Amino acid sequence: PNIIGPQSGGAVENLPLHQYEAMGEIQTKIPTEVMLTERREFELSEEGFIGLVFRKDSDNAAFFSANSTQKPRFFGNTPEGKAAETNYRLGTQLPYMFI
Amino acid sequence: DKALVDAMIAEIDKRLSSQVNEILHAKEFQKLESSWRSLKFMVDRTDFRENTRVEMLNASKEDLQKDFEDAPEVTKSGLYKLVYSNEYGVFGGKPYGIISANYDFNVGPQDMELLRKCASVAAMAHAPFIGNAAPEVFGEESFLKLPDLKDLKSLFEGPQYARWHSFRESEDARYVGLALPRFLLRLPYGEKTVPVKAFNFTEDVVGHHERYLWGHASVALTSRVADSFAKFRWSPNIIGPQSGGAVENLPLHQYEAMGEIQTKIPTEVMLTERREFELSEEGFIGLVFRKDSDNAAFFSANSTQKPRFFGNTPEGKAAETNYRLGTQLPYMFIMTRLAHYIKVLQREQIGSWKEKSDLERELNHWLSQYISDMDDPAPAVRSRRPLRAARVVVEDVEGQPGWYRCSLQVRPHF
Amino acid sequence: SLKFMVDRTDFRENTRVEMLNASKEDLQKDFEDAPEVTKSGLYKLVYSNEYGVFGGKPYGIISANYDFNVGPQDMELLRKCASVAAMAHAPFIGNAAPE
Amino acid sequence: MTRLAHYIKVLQREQIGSWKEKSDLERELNHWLSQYISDMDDPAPAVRSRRPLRAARVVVEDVEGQPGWYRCSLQVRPHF
Amino acid sequence: LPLKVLMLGDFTGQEDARPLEQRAPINVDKANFNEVMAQQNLKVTLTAADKLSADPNATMNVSLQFKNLNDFSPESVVNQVPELKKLLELRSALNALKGPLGNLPAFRKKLQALLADEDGRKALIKELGLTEETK
Amino acid sequence: LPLKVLMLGDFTGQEDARPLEQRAPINVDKANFNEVMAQQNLKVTLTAADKLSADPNATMNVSLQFKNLNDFSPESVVNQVPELKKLLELRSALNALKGPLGNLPAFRKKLQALLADEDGRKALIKELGLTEETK
């Protein structure tokens, strides 16, 4: 269950680095193709994708969440309906699916 | 620059809330909403693990009149079919405890006739019919005018109430029970007390308290019956702030007054003891508001039936006592439970070798099960044993061997 | 005066104090508006929510920051306070005005 | 008197439902009231403060006419 | 013997053609109340005064649908009324722009998207565009 | 059983429209008394005789606000009444000048600042300027 946090156990450490010349300076090829921002990672999570985000200038990346492909269902906003929503989302999350 | 954009958001939300108020204050929308929400407010206050059951029957008053007038007799009405026939009069089935009608009644002839039919059905099935009365029944625009009424008893002398006056004298009126003021179901939307997502909606209740989501108090009374039955298997403890007629946890709404800030009463008005007593004399079930609480109480549950007066002699006063006992729902419920048990249990005895004295002995031994004839009584423990005394006599139907005539008279606790 | 009272007590010794903002005129307004003392707000928050509540606790005493004259309104207020105090078994303490 | 009334309400509520006969009420109530009684020879002055009562009498009858509840009389003689 | 109660009332926005003796009752409990609502299927076709403009002859007809009690919340009401849902989307666009969450090109594209709805009135569209900061 | 006392009284400058039992009681203790004052919110709108001039028809209306007991001190009272706060600023200016803590140009600038307050009376302004040494 512990695979969705920089401290919880979803952190990937020891990524390769590659410094090379830029426009007269020298920058490192990002270990992932892009440096994903928090908003973009959140959008990908809403789209059911597991985005490995790069720690700004790290050799470290992190999986902030491991949602499955399944899209959560919406229920009427009553006590029972919100309970149903909670259970369903729990089902939609791999960190509990593993248990 | 951003301050101007925020002003734009303020005006936009202002217009949007202007329209949303029209939606949320629409009479049709509030009809549907209050129906379902009051229904849930009843259901979630019961305990289905205590053998409590509830069924929903979608029917409007107009269609109730349509069925009752279309049928040649009440025994052939659909409601009677699904209340008595499919339940109390069905071997292997179960009888309906009570009927809660989410309706408001006026003095109109259609409403009076509907009440007559409901009284007949309730009498045939031994189950009371509970509903509510509309404000115009008192000749007032809304319950908020109740403190201006100087004398309800004199108000009811007008010819406009002739039919109601006769209805109160019918012997089926014991199965009719109407409640007075309604009660709040939802606190108005507000960014602090009742916020919503995204849109910064602040519900604006105008001068018309009809903007508030009022709910039919019949459901609250039903919760009372439910609690009594969940604790004891009997429904007599529903007429006191401590006995079990108290409704707790009412919504509140503080808002500015004339420079102070005051709370919208959960009921339309704060009924005084004298006014509540007058309503009780008029056969109404008034849910009184505990002066500044979120608590209300039903001080009494008299039926619509008016008590009869007898000559002031020992026998005459005895007759008065019995009749009033009949006029009170808190004892009518004991009678109804007894009738259900008698039907069910006797059906199983049909066919056995029973002589008259055998009926006498068995019935006595059975009735003793609900009798608490002791010395000094576990107060609210004679709740589970509501009867204090009971007498049973059994005679023979002459010229019909195997059939008997049974008389059961009970003295319950006061 | 409120603080002079509070800071001379010892909350570690199971001592508690609640504040109820009410003027004498409004006390008379509530007591006369209600049909009976058992339905007054003060009775609600003194007896009903305390001594007569399973799981609750009863109010020890009531301290009213008021001065009383021989006026009929003050006399009636004293009558109501005596009734409530008798019903809840808690004395009502106040002060008398020089007049 | 007021403290006694509070304790009686609270503690009796918890006893509702138990198998109590009249004499059972008498014995239990006596044993309980003794907790605040200081009836010796010469009192620790301002120590009968914690035990304000010197004497106490309790009588329990049954209210007749339906059975399980009683009429209790409690009279106390406190220190002067 | 259980304690069974019969709640009779107008739980729908219209009367049923089925006769009373034919329509059936529904057993309700805490573990299926919302399911009972969804299966009953709630619908309200109603007209209220159109306060999104300044015309007393302007009226707004709505067709709301209910499956659970939370469908009675203003969020659902707005979700089911495009004349208000478009205004909520405009609200989100303006808050995003004012908080600097998106650039002006994205803001313009999304604004066109919101105003493209053919069910909206031109007056409403003009009132919405009047809220856009000049920059 | 704890010993609970109920202090009932007029702790505010006005009555509430709130039904007596609608309003709730507040638990008070040594670790939160001041917080209880601040949350209760104290305000006094009152008129007293204006003794800053020589006119019996002159009256002064003040709107004091209280969050803690020290808001009852004369320093807070002056802070909340501009007709006196300006006089305290003038006092500080005169003491600074007489103690040689500031030069005459700074003194003049600050004096203009103090007297610029539009809520002050011209008579008060004249009385304040009459206290300035000629040099």
Coordinates of all heavy atoms in Angstrom, one line a residue, chain C residues 58, chain D residues 1-14, chain F residues 1, unseen atoms left out:
Chain C
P58 N -26.3 18.7 36.6 CA -27.2 19.8 37.0 C -26.5 21.0 37.4 O -25.3 21.0 37.9
Chain D
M1 N -28.9 20.1 51.1 CA -30.1 19.5 50.5 C -30.0 19.4 49.0 O -30.3 18.4 48.4
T2 N -29.5 20.5 48.3 CA -29.5 20.5 46.9 C -28.5 19.5 46.3 O -28.7 18.8 45.3
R3 N -27.3 19.5 46.9 CA -26.3 18.5 46.5 C -26.8 17.1 46.6 O -26.7 16.2 45.7
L4 N -27.5 16.8 47.7 CA -28.1 15.5 47.9 C -29.1 15.2 46.8 O -29.2 14.1 46.3
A5 N -30.0 16.2 46.4 CA -30.9 15.9 45.3 C -30.3 15.6 44.0 O -30.7 14.7 43.3
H6 N -29.2 16.4 43.7 CA -28.5 16.1 42.4 C -27.9 14.6 42.4 O -28.2 13.9 41.5
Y7 N -27.2 14.3 43.5 CA -26.7 12.9 43.6 C -27.8 11.8 43.5 O -27.6 10.8 42.8
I8 N -28.9 12.1 44.1 CA -30.0 11.1 44.1 C -30.5 10.9 42.7 O -30.7 9.8 42.2
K9 N -30.9 12.0 42.0 CA -31.3 11.9 40.6 C -30.3 11.1 39.8 O -30.7 10.1 39.2
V10 N -29.1 11.6 39.7 CA -28.1 10.9 38.9 C -27.9 9.5 39.2 O -28.2 8.6 38.3
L11 N -27.6 9.1 40.4 CA -27.3 7.8 40.8 C -28.5 6.8 40.7 O -28.3 5.6 40.4
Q12 N -29.7 7.3 40.9 CA -30.9 6.5 40.8 C -31.2 6.1 39.4 O -31.6 5.0 39.1
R13 N -31.1 7.1 38.5 CA -31.2 6.8 37.1 C -30.4 5.6 36.6 O -31.0 4.8 35.8
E14 N -29.2 5.4 37.1 CA -28.4 4.3 36.8 C -28.9 3.0 37.3 O -28.6 1.9 36.8
Chain F
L1 N -19.9 14.8 40.8 CA -20.6 15.9 40.1 C -19.9 17.2 40.3 O -19.6 17.7 41.4

